[PDB]
Amino acid sequence: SNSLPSGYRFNEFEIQEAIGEGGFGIVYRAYDHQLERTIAIKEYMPTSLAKRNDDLSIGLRGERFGKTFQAGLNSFIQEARLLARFSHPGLLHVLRFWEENGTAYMGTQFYSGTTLKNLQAQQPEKIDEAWIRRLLPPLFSAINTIHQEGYLHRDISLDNIQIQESQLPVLLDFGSARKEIGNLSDETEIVLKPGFAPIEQYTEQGPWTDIYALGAVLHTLIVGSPPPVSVVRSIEDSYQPLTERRPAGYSPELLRTVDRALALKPEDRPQTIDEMAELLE
Numbered sequence: 001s002n003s004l005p006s007g008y009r010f011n012e013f014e015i016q017e018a019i020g021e022g023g024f025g026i027v028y029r030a031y032d033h034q035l036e037r038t039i040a041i042k043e044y045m046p047t048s049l050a051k052r053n054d055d056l057s058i059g060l061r062g063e064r065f066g067k068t069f070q071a072g073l074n075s076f077i078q079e080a081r082l083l084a085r086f087s088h089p090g091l092l093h094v095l096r097f098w099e100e101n102g103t104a105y106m107g108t109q110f111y112s113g114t115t116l117k118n119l120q121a122q123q124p125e126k127i128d129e130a131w132i133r134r135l136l137p138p139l140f141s142a143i144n145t146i147h148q149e150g151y152l153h154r155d156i157s158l159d160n161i162q163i164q165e166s167q168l169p170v171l172l173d174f175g176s177a178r179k180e181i182g183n184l185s186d187e188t189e190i191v192l193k194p195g196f197a198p199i200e201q202y203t204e205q206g207p208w209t210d211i212y213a214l215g216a217v218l219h220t221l222i223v224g225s226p227p228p229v230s231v232v233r234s235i236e237d238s239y240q241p242l243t244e245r246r247p248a249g250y251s252p253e254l255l256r257t258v259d260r261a262l263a264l265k266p267e268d269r270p271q272t273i274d275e276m277a278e279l280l281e
């Protein structure tokens with residue numbers, strides 16, 4: 001692990017545990033001793049470009065990586081600024097941002113529960129049609145809130161949706177720094193998510209782009225895996241409609257909503273979150 005130790009201090013903040021460690025950042029449970037509350041701290045840390053020094057700052061693995069490391073850092077800052085535009089229960093709430101240790105940190109609300117990806121892996125039996133229909137209103141609301149301010153998410157999958165102990169969802173991360181590093185480094189495999197990204201993301205985009213990814217999430221919950229990669233579909237569409245599979249315990253109404261969200265061409269999908277929600281009625 002490259003993570004700061006339990007007990008490390010950022011003035012009033014104390015690290016408690018590294019709870020997430022991926023290729024591009026570390027997430028810590030932390031504590032604010034001034035306000036006496038638990039928070040999360042997200043630390044930019046691209047492992048392919050940087051390493052942990054003895055004094056616990058971050059340093060480049062090679063001088064040639066500096067330009068890309070800085071561009072990822074700038075994208076991390078821009079994503080924090082985007083999330084700071086909102087005060088919505090389904091969007092990661094940003095408390096503070098600062099630079100230190102050669103990198104940057106976001107202090108955020110700490111959420112109960114775990115990711116949808118982990119829930120689907122650990123407790124698939126909890127995920128049925130009734131549970132999905134309770135998930136959708138607050139998830140629709142969070143995504144639509146982004147859209148109404150003129151932005152798109154563009155990185156939806158199961159990995160970045162938190163399911164709280166209340167079952168309410170939170171969008172945690174837009175992948176901005178990861179995707180910028182991938183574009184600049186020609187590491188194409190870290191930019192789009194296969195099976196979740198629709199055809200128009202491979203090179204126009206709008207609310208329908210996030211709608212397709214949401215359909216791909218729902219498809220994964222219902223049958224266990226995402227639909228075929230969208231470029232492959234654009235050559236020979238092997239997607240078989242869920243209305244035709246008939247997985248046990250799922251209504252044609254929910255199944256056709258997923259199928260419509262997964263229409264290959266943007267114009268054939270629901271055009272807004274509101275349009276997709278109407279399909280379930």
Ligand SMILES: Nc1ncnc2c1ncn2[C@@H]1O[C@H](COP(=O)(O)OP(=O)(O)CP(=O)(O)O)[C@@H](O)[C@H]1O
Pocket residue numbers: 019020021022023025027040092108109110111112113114115118162172
């Ligand atoms: N604000 C927040 N509050 C609580 N948990 C958060 C959070 N932001 C991110 N997380 C958690 O951080 C983790 C980030 O995922 P990541 O893939 O980087 O780490 P990981 O694989 O080491 C642990 P996991 O098995 O959950 O994925 C997820 O478990 C997510 O639930």
